[PDB]
Design a protein around this motif. Structure first.
Motif, PDB file in Angstrom:
ATOM      1  N   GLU A 144      25.051  -6.787 -13.813  1.00  0.00           N
ATOM      2  CA  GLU A 144      25.415  -8.342 -14.225  1.00  0.00           C
ATOM      3  C   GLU A 144      27.012  -8.243 -14.458  1.00  0.00           C
ATOM      4  O   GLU A 144      27.780  -8.736 -13.705  1.00  0.00           O
ATOM      5  N   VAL A 145      27.580  -7.689 -15.393  1.00  0.00           N
ATOM      6  CA  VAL A 145      28.813  -7.843 -15.945  1.00  0.00           C
ATOM      7  C   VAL A 145      29.727  -7.085 -14.782  1.00  0.00           C
ATOM      8  O   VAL A 145      30.781  -7.774 -14.544  1.00  0.00           O
ATOM      9  N   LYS A 146      29.489  -5.896 -14.082  1.00  0.00           N
ATOM     10  CA  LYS A 146      30.248  -5.358 -13.320  1.00  0.00           C
ATOM     11  C   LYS A 146      30.302  -6.244 -11.997  1.00  0.00           C
ATOM     12  O   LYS A 146      31.497  -6.343 -11.383  1.00  0.00           O
ATOM     13  N   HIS A 147      29.607  -6.666 -11.502  1.00  0.00           N
ATOM     14  CA  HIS A 147      29.488  -7.544 -10.292  1.00  0.00           C
ATOM     15  C   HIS A 147      30.481  -8.734 -10.763  1.00  0.00           C
ATOM     16  O   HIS A 147      31.306  -9.213  -9.779  1.00  0.00           O
ATOM     17  N   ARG A 148      30.246  -9.359 -11.878  1.00  0.00           N
ATOM     18  CA  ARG A 148      31.017 -10.592 -12.354  1.00  0.00           C
ATOM     19  C   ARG A 148      32.478 -10.260 -12.379  1.00  0.00           C
ATOM     20  O   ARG A 148      33.232 -10.982 -12.052  1.00  0.00           O
TER      21      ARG A 148
END
Ligand code: HEM
Ligand SMILES: [C-]#N
Length: 222
Positions: free
Chosen positions: A184-188
């Motif tokens: 989630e964080v990586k993608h964002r």
């Protein structure tokens, strides 16, 4: 995959586009004068002020804390000196605040105030560039505008509290890789970095032009 590698890979394409923007091509050609350089630096003053203000707000938040290096990295104080050099004693009310700058600042405040986990995307985009390609920009500026090697007028590109920017960049990368990371964080984060790059291109293309509701597109939109 490390966040530092993910970010580098996710921004390599937009980076090529940014360095080939009209303004940057002109800059690398030594065709930017005092007027144009002042516009960019004045805009960065606003951008870094917001960026580092948001960093301060979230300095104790784990999503960014490992990257809290104000002594070594922060540019606001340096830009203040540069503003005094280029705009004079009363630079405060003399420097411009362009529409593209305003919207960059606006996104920085949204990120810092509402989505702090994405702040790293913005610090990466600006700082890691400053520590590397920014050194090439510094050389271009010195040669083009006859700025002394002593550093006056180019404090922004000078890091007195670091021995070797390349070395520090490596450290910063390693700490970036310690941040709690999930899909989630990586993608964002990688997506927000692309936005950060775009905000920069919009600024530079806006400045080039000057030299020559939530879903509403920015006034400085390409
Ligand atoms: C005149 C146009 C530009 C030049 C000459 C330039 C050149 C460079 C160079 C030579 C590097 C180091 C690559 C390496 O050996 O690893 C670099 C890295 C970087 N640049 Fe630029 N750059 C330019 C514009 C920009 C802009 C507008 C941004 C966005 C604010 C930017 C952000 C970055 C970032 C974030 C990195 C670090 C990449 C990484 O290691 O992950 N650059 N740049
Ligand atoms: C790249 N600076």
């Amino acid at each position: 995959q490390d966040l530092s590698e993910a970010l580098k890979e996710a921004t390599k394409e937009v980076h090529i586009r940014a360095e080939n923007s009209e303004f940057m091509r002109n800059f690398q050609k030594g065709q930017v004068s005092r007027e144009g350089f002042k516009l960019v630096m004045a805009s960065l003053y606003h951008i870094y002020t917001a960026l580092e203000e948001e960093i301060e707000r979230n300095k104790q938040n784990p999503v960014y804390a490992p990257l809290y290096f104000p002594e070594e990295l922060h540019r606001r104080a340096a830009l203040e000196q540069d503003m005094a050099f280029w705009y004079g004693p009363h630079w405060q009310e003399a420097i411009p605040y362009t529409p593209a700058t305003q919207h960059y600042v606006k996104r920085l405040h949204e990120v810092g105030g509402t989505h702090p986990e994405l702040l790293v995307a913005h610090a990466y985009t600006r700082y890691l560039g400053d520590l590397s390609g920014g050194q090439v920009l510094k050389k271009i500026a010195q040669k083009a505008m006859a700025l002394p090697s002593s550093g006056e007028g180019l404090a922004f590109f000078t890091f007195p509290s670091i021995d070797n920017p390349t070395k520090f960049k490596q450290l910063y990368r390693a700490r970036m890789n310690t941040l709690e990371m999930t899909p989630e964080v990586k993608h964002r984060v990688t997506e927000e970095a692309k936005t950060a790059f775009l905000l920069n291109i919009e600024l530079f293309e806006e400045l080039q032009a000057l030299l020559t509701e939530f879903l509403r597109q920015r006034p400085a939109s390409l």
